[PDB]
Amino acid sequence: MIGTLKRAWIPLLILVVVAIAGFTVQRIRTFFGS
Amino acid sequence: QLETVGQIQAVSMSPDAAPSMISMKHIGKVFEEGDSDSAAMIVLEGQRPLGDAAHAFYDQMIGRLQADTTHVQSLQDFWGDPLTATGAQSSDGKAAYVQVKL
Amino acid sequence: TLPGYRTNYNDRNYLPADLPANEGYAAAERHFSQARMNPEVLMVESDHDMRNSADFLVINKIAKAIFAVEGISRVQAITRPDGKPIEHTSIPFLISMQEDSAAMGEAFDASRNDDSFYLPPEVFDNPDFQRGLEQFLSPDGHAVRFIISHEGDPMSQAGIARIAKIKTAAKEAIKGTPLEGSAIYLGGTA
Amino acid sequence: NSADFLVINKIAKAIFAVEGISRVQAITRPDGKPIEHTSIPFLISMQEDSAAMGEAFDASRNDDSFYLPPEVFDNPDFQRGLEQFLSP
16 A cells, blocks of 8 residues: 555665665675685 | 784784685695795895805704794795705805795 | 776885885895795695606696796796706607717707606605605695796786686696596685 | 598697597597507617506506507507598
8 A cells, every 4th residue: 555655665765775785795795715 | 002902813814715725724734834824935145156155054044943833834945955956046046045934 | 097997916016115025025036036935836636646657747747737827937846846847857868879869868958848758766766856755745645736936026917817827727737637636726925 | 541640639639728628539549548558658669667667658648749550550459440530
């Protein structure tokens, strides 16, 4: 429902950014050594 | 002070998972000459070609160096050995060196 | 200006030239080269005693294959104890009117021909060989190591790109030999 | 003939020297391994020394020299493999 999702859009965007960045970081953390 | 603790708890330059660090540790383990990656080079250079006095001083010096078991882990002579002596000497004969593992 | 950025790993370029370490660096550069004090060590670890005439052929093969890399000078092995091949090992000495064959052999030693190599099996019981055999082969003979020097700056972008080439050359030298599948370790500063 | 088999061994070695290549198989190399008794200590032929040299050159597959004398083409134990690698 849009009325309540567009009220917490900042925490949702922060969560999306944190998730994407964390997955990309844990992916890059495996390139060294191998 | 901060710098005292900083020099006390210093960390290695290279990671433990570095292929070259693993390689150096394994080379030292297999050849039984220390589990370090640090090594120094004692060069001795003269204005004239190194003769027998230089060889005697070098023998006494490596005898001294091998005694300090806590710091000097090993060394590759390569100059007290007639088979390999020319590998640790310049083409002109005025310089020689020995690698010491620390 | 960013797509022209080059970096450097030689720490002695960014230090005053009046440090004792740099003084000895200069003393060594006056006589050998700038890359003699920063050698690489390559170790090939097999699963059998390599102290025999059959495996020393593969060791000489590895030494030559590493020496054939572009920026490499002064590879040092047991079959090459001073970066120079052992004398009386070229093809005019596996063959043995004798003033001709002696001239051939001594012409093959004045250039360090290095096209053939045997080292008969009576070099392993020679006492004047063991002190050098302990430097290059493991105490149980299962590993052999090579000491590699660079031509220019070891810690440049080229000296760092040479590491993969050294490893590839060592891996291709043992391809198709009884030493195939051995582990190759490369340590050093570069 | 013995003259062209030298070039065949040259081609085999040159292909084997490519980086990602393993197990090149030719008539001068019938199992990816060089033929024994073809290295330089066998073109040369106190004999306990030369035999040791030859058998040290066969335990490593030295592959620095190669002849195959011309009496291998009339050897019946060679034709069944000569038909696999050379045109009829």
